[PDB]
Amino acid sequence: EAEKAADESERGMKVIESRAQKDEEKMEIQEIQLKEAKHIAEDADRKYEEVARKLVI
Amino acid sequence: EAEKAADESERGMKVIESRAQKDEEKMEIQEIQLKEAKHIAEDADRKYEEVARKLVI
């Protein structure tokens, strides 16, 4: 009985760990995309303010 | 042997569940901030285009 319980717990542990690792990898990719979005936002903001100042002059 | 295996399996399942929930939260917040940043980027690009045209005029 104990052997059966241990094997079932082992299988559940392995599958849940695999799914967690894959979702963690995708989360890392999402963070990379967020960083790129941050950079794009900052660059565009600088563009806009510079152009507005030049237009005023 | 079975007792020790069961204890280790329980601890591993606990830690994997905690890490999985952490990953889900990180994925959610990453997606939210990503969408907000993309919308801000769209707004900035539109403003840049409009002010550039006015500047040429």
| Side chain identity, residue A19 | R
* Facing B13 at nearest CB: one of A13, A40, A45: A13
Contacts of A19 (CB under 8 A, 6+ apart): B20
Task: Please tell me the experimental approach by which this structure was elucidated.
Answer: cryo-EM
Residue of chain A with shortest Cα separation from B45 = A44
CA–CA separation, B56 and B54 (whole Å): 5
Structure tokens at A43: 């660059």
Contact predicate A20/B27, CB 8 Å: no
Cα A15–chain centre separation: 21
User: What letter would DSSP give residue B5?
Assistant: H
Helices (H), chain B: 2-56
Helices (H), chain A: 2-56
Resolution as reported, in Å: 5.0
Does A5 touch chain B if contact means CB atoms closer than 8 Å? yes
Buried b vs exposed e over B3-41: b needs ≥16 C-beta within 10 Å? eebeeebeebbeebeebbeebeebbeebeebbeebeebb
